Amino acid sequence: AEKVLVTGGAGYIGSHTVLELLEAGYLPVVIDNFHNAFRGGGSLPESLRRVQELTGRSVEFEEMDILDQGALQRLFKKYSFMAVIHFAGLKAMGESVQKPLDYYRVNLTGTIQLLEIMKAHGVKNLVFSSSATVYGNPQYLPLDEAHPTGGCTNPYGKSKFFIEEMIRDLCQADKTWNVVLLRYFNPTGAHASGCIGEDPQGIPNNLMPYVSQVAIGRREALNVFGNDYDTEDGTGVRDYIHVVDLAKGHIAALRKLKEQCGCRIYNLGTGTGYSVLQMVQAMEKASGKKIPYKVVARREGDVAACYANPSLAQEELGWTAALGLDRMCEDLWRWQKQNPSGFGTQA
Template sequence: MILITGGAGYIGAHVALECMVRGEEVLIVDNLCNSHRSAIDRISTLAGKRPGFIYGDVRNRRLLDTLLRDYPIDAVVHCAGLKAVGESVREPLRYYDTNVGGSVVLCQAMAQAGVFRLVFSSSATVYGDCTRMPINEACATGQPTNPYGMSKLMCENVMKSVASSDPRWSIGLLRYFNPIGAHASGLLGEAPTSTPNNLLPYLLQVASGERQALSVYGNDYPTPDGTGVRDYIHVVDLALGHIRALEALRERRGVSIWNLGTGRGYSVLDVIKAFEKVTGVQIPLNFEARRPGDIACCWADPKKSIDELDWQARYSLERMLADAWRWQCNQREQEVVRQAN
């Protein structure tokens, strides 16, 4: 059985689904601080069976001890955590408490229970403002430009330390680039519970009429059009990377690091233009000052994941945007029906 922390969230839910359709038993623990219980129903519909679900916080050691004792868990995918760069600048202590504190408690509970296979949702933000593009795993992690990235780097260091102290650990650090998109069914996608902090959910809310205009933070970066350039990866491709990592860790010990990205960067304006082309919806823009903690460019060299995991991103930017829009439209239709009733 696989324990997925944060498994009702955007990435965790897609990981849970991909595990289940491959026959794995899944137990989700989530405090629903930025997710919805309805995600469990959606996973159940798509998988044809229901994952186990426990409402709870990964920082609760007593809860984790109970789960690891009472369920036949042999691996953990750790997705629980806060993830918004701008918010982390405003609330750094909250990020260190949740992300770092939660990871420490989880590793303590796993070690006590004798469970030593762990996949961690890390981030490309650990590379900081790297001047070398594309970024491979040999690039120095250095100094992340925001507390979110720093919290992820601190978590990585915790996990490297525990693996050095005990040879039974098999840990995969997955450095995500920028997940977007949704399940092709339109039934599972990103559903932020508050004001979105990332480009695509904000873009979707503008396109659906929930917000008047899209704020573009910074048009004076040293990039071809002045807006930030990122490596956008389909969330299903990302979820499949977790599957491959879990498989690889059966045969590996110590810490392994893999970038999960496409190897191609798109600017904010590239994404907006592609979205307008895919959907036919025009997006009004407001250009604003750069946000603290943001950097100009970030895209992956995925060669190590291709070679070691036999994993490669498959979906195009257009497919990511089309799937995300299908999810958004489905959500709006459901809301109309709820209001009518």
């Protein structure tokens, strides 16, 4: 059978997706450069070594940068891929605005190169990791796929938007390409085993890991970025979606490609928004601990509220986000508790 190439497969979403793929009968080939993934004691990234244990299935992996043309070409020559799931890229530690060229090089040129290599090797089926950030500051809610895109605040979001645009044109020009662009909302939670999860390096830039870190006792209090937004409690509102559900949406995307779907774009969210305080409260409930916090200044570029309109995906992808808030918090807690300091090499 033909393989599925997973770029950035050792990361948060990627590792969860590799797990889903293995369970569903697929044969992935994963690549990662360790830019934001922990190396295990062996060749495999720790996250994937664990996915191998969890599934009882082998993970084919190669350490490689998507920017390395020769390595990528050799890879496409060695295997017969039927599709590519592209997670590799830079996300922001609120860094993008300051290092635009890094985002443009890694995300933009990296993806252009991948598309070129794909085309040359006759692989024209892609699943791309997009984001709700491409919608920019919401002009209305909930955010449906028809909401305007572009006009993003930072280089990270613009990079995502430019990539979407490029893929849309590619599909427009060549009807033989099939591409599913998945606009993720705010992924959270972890695999139910508690063995893998989000493994941030240093001080977490995103909410959830910070909250869990407070709950576990690593951090004293959560810093709440502004409480004067035009939301019910004044704190930011987001559509948190269980990483497992998100991962499963990728399998749905592969099925969609098989229908010779052309270019399709789908939001991957729950359709339900929760504020910062609400997430804190849910974490107190999951963890059985009080979670202190302090209100500080707004974070540059933060939007008031963002949540998806998930109907298109339910309809066309035949997918829905099955896990609720308590599940997300309980799963995140299990991962946090079982792995107080994230991933580590085997003892």
